[PDB]
Each structure stands twice: as structure tokens, then as C-alpha cells.
A paper describes a structure:
The expected advantage of choosing this reference is an increased stability of the pMHCII as the tryptophan side-chain optimally fills the P1 pocket that dominates the DR1-binding groove, but cannot be accommodated by P9 and thus prevents peptide reorientation. A small but significant increase of the stability of this complex is also reflected by a gain in midpoint denaturation temperature of approximately 4 °C. Additionally, we solved the crystal structure of DR1/CW at 1.4 Å resolution, and confirmed that DR1/CW has the standard canonical fold and that the new tryptophan side-chain is well accommodated by the P1 pocket. HDX protection factors were derived from exponentially-fitted (EX2 regime) intensity decays of backbone amide signals in a series of heteronuclear single quantum coherence (HSQC) spectra. The results reveal that the N-terminal half (region coloured red in Fig. 1c) of the peptide-binding groove extending from the P1 to P6 pocket region, including residues αF48-L60 and βK65-Q92, displays strikingly little protection from HDX in DR1/Cw. Additionally, the indole proton of the highly conserved αW43, which is needed to flip out of the peptide-binding groove to form an essential part of the DM interface, is not protected from HDX indicating side-chain mobility.
These MHCII proteins are capable of binding and presenting both foreign and self-antigens to potentially activate CD4+ T cells via cognate T cell receptors as part of the adaptive immune response. The structural hallmarks of antigen binding by MHCII molecules are well understood at the phenomenological level: Optimal occupation of the four main pockets (P1, P4, P6, P9) in the MHCII-binding groove by peptide side-chains and concomitant formation of a conserved set of hydrogen bonds mainly between peptide backbone and MHCII side-chains are necessary and sufficient to guarantee high-affinity binding of certain epitopes and their subsequent surveillance by T cells. Initially, the class II-associated invariant chain peptide (CLIP) occupies the MHCII-binding groove, but can later be replaced in the endosomal compartments for higher affinity antigens.
Author numbering:
A (entry chain B): 2 to 104, 114 to 198
B (entry chain C): 104 to 118
C (entry chain A): 0 to 180
């Protein structure tokens, strides 16, 4: 199927800063991946982004009542939907599960929400920042995230490694210890 | 249960 | 770590000649819901979201008729200039660390592509499989490309290997991304 394609995308973007204290509304019109015309609540009217969108900015700016309602939409649309969704989006918290296994030592941190997280490696109580490689943050598409943080290390006998995770869902770090084989152990 | 709202795009000029 | 900003996006599209169109809301990269045009039904991404909110699906159908009308006008205004295909990136991951015989899910994450038409197949030991598969709608990106997820439930094995096979008009060849235990 090599028939030519023609695509039209519309986006209404509600940008929130400091709760609903600061709210900006964008309406963006995009043909074949290129934005042609845009309403920005900072400007209060349509503006062409490319020459292809000039006709539309002119025509839509002439419809004054609808333009008034679009200037009000920071309240009637953006703030409204934020209030409806807050409890299950803004305030969603799902605790990470932490698994440590050799592959390298891998600290797999899964199932968590929101995305901001800190994962740290310790060796015998001391933080190790060298030989660390991370996937970064991966969005799973189902309102959870994962990340894998690898430590390249020469695991000796007697060594004890700890993966530590801080995340807004917990008030104290999650830790998982992994130990190499014991060589010799003694009474004292 | 609270109602989610949508915004409606405008028609382009046809002539 | 606590988020300093949030973005809610209502993302719609119409595509010719396919006559495909979608309507969804995105919160910081996750789908809140979409309207299934054929079922005329609001589909919440996690079913519990619908305990807290409702959306009248008919409004999305009305919007998609405006989007189609405008697409027809833009197509001619551009002198029938077609979209440039941009092929996807693909990654395959499991949802959780794998444990033998414990139900898990393979995720095929398809990213950075346009137009929003893909053909995705799962293979097990080289053979197509479909039992229990699911997928998302086409999710938005800041560069106006798309994202999409496909999922395959499975029982992890030391012997079975899987591929996600992705076909798109911007690819010179179909792509495979494998996964094994």
C-alpha cells in the first residue's frame, strides 16, 4: 500500500503550574506533522504558524463570541478537568517493587507512579556512583513506570551490595541487599 | 459523578 | 521529586485515505481515556477512573467530523502534498522481573513515527501468536509523532523466545525486536 496519506492532528494542551494557580491553554492544528495555526491563551487570538494556516487564523479570529469562550476555556475547560481528574492522576501513588539480581548487578525498580525516583547503589555501606548504567525512566503505558539500574562490579567474597530507592510513595527508603558467597566466617 | 469536558475545534472556511 | 507542572492534552486526528480517526486525553504521557468511535463508547485506561468521572462519547464523534472536514480542505489547500513517513523506534521489555512460569507481560513500545498506522505481530519461537494480546491507541508526542504500546501475556520460560514484529510504511524492511529469558 503506497497510496499517499494526508493527516490532520488537533491538540488542546492545558499546562498547569503550581496546581491550578497558573494555567495556559494551547489549541494546535497540525497538517502532515507541521503545525499551521495555533491559539495560545497568552496571546488571546489565533496566529498562523506557517503560511498554510494564515487563512484559518484570520477566519477564526473574526468569530468573536467563540473567541471569547476560548479565552474563558482556561477556567471552563482546563481548570475544570484538572479538578475532575486530580484524585486519580495528580495524586496517584503506586509504590515501586525492587528486585536485585546478577546479569553486573541489576537493580530493577518496577510498577511505580509517579515517575520521579532516585535509585542508588551502596557497597558495604558506601555509596557507589562509578560503574553505574541506567535505562532511565520507562513509561509502561498502563500508569506505571520502571527503571533498571546496573552496577558493574568485581563481586568479592564478603561483599554486601544494597540498592536503595526513594520515591514519593514512601517516607523512608526501600532497600534490597544482595550478598556474594561467603568465603570464610568466624565466631567472635 | 463529575463530568469531564472537551473543547471543540472550528470548521475551516469552505468557500 | 514531586511534580512541578502537569499537562493535560486532548489529542485527536483524522487520516485519509484510511478513514481512521481517534480521540483521547493524555496526562503527562499516560492515556486517561479514549472514545472508541465504532462503539461510541468512552474507554477509561484504568477502569477505576470511570468511578470518578464520566465523558459523553458523542462529543468526540462530532469533533472527528470537524477534523475530517478540515483535513479535506487542507489536503487541497496544500495541492495534495502527502505526509512524509517517519519510521518507528521499537523496544521490548517485560513489565516485571521475570520468574519462571509466573504470568508476566511483554511490552512492545513503538515510538517516534507517523502516520499513525502500524502492523504489529507477536512471534513465539518464530510463529505468530495472538492469545490475550492488547494494545493502546496512538498516543501524542511533543514533536507530533506518535507512540503506541502492544502487550502479550506469557508464562516465562528458559526455552521460548519472543519477537515483536513491526511494519510501517517508513521502514525499508519489517523490524524484529526479540526477547529471551
Amino acid at each position: 500500500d503506497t497510496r499517499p496519506r494526508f493527516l490532520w492532528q488537533l491538540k488542546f494542551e492545558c499546562h498547569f503550574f503550581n496546581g491550578t494557580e497558573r494555567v495556559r491553554l494551547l489549541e494546535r492544528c497540525i497538517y502532515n506533522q507541521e503545525e499551521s495555526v495555533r491559539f495560545d491563551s497568552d496571546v488571546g487570538e489565533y496566529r498562523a504558524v506557517t503560511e498554510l494556516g494564515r487563512p484559518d487564523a484570520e477566519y477564526w479570529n473574526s468569530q468573536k463570541d467563540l473567541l471569547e469562550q476560548r479565552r474563558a476555556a482556561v477556567d471552563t475547560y482546563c481548570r475544570h478537568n484538572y479538578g475532575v481528574g486530580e484524585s486519580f492522576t495528580v495524586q496517584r501513588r503506586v509504590e515501586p517493587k525492587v528486585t536485585v539480581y546478577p546479569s553486573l548487578l541489576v537493580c530493577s525498580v518496577s510498577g511505580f507512579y509517579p515517575g520521579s525516583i532516585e535509585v542508588r547503589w551502596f557497597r558495604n555501606g558506601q555509596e557507589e556512583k562509578a560503574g553505574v548504567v541506567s535505562t532511565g525512566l520507562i513509561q509502561n503505558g498502563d500508569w506505571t513506570f520502571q527503571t533498571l539500574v546496573m552496577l558493574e562490579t568485581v563481586p568479592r567474597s564478603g561483599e554486601v551490595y544494597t540498592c536503595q530507592v526513594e520515591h514519593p510513595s514512601v517516607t523512608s527508603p526501600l532497600t534490597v541487599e544482595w550478598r556474594a558467597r561467603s568465603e570464610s566466617a568466624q565466631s567472635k | 459523578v463529575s463530568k469531564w469536558r472537551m473543547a471543540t475545534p472550528l470548521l475551516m472556511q469552505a468557500l | 521529586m514531586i511534580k512541578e507542572e502537569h499537562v493535560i492534552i486532548q489529542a485527536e486526528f483524522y487520516l485519509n485515505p484510511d478513514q481512521s480517526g481517534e480521540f483521547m486525553f493524555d496526562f503527562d504521557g499516560d492515556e486517561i481515556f479514549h472514545v472508541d468511535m465504532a462503539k461510541k463508547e468512552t474507554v477509561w485506561r484504568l477502569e477505576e477512573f470511570g468511578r470518578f468521572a464520566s465523558f459523553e462519547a458523542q462529543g468526540a464523534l462530532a469533533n472527528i467530523a470537524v477534523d475530517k472536514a478540515n483535513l479535506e480542505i487542507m489536503t487541497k489547500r496544500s495541492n495534495y502534498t502527502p505526509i512524509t513517513n517517519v519510521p518507528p523506534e521499537v523496544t521490548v521489555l517485560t513489565n516485571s522481573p521475570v520468574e519462571l512460569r509466573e504470568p508476566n507481560v511483554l511490552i512492545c513500545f513503538i515510538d517516534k513515527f507517523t502516520p499513525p498506522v502500524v502492523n504489529v505481530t507477536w512471534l513465539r519461537n518464530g510463529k505468530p501468536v495472538t492469545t490475550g494480546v492488547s494494545e493502546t491507541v496512538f498516543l501524542p508526542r511533543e514533536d507530533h509523532l506518535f507512540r503506541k504500546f502492544h502487550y502479550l501475556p506469557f508464562l516465562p520460560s528458559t526455552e521460548d523466545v519472543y519477537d515483536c514484529r513491526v511494519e510501517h510504511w517508513g521502514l525499508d524492511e519489517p523490524l524484529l525486536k526479540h526477547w529471551e529469558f
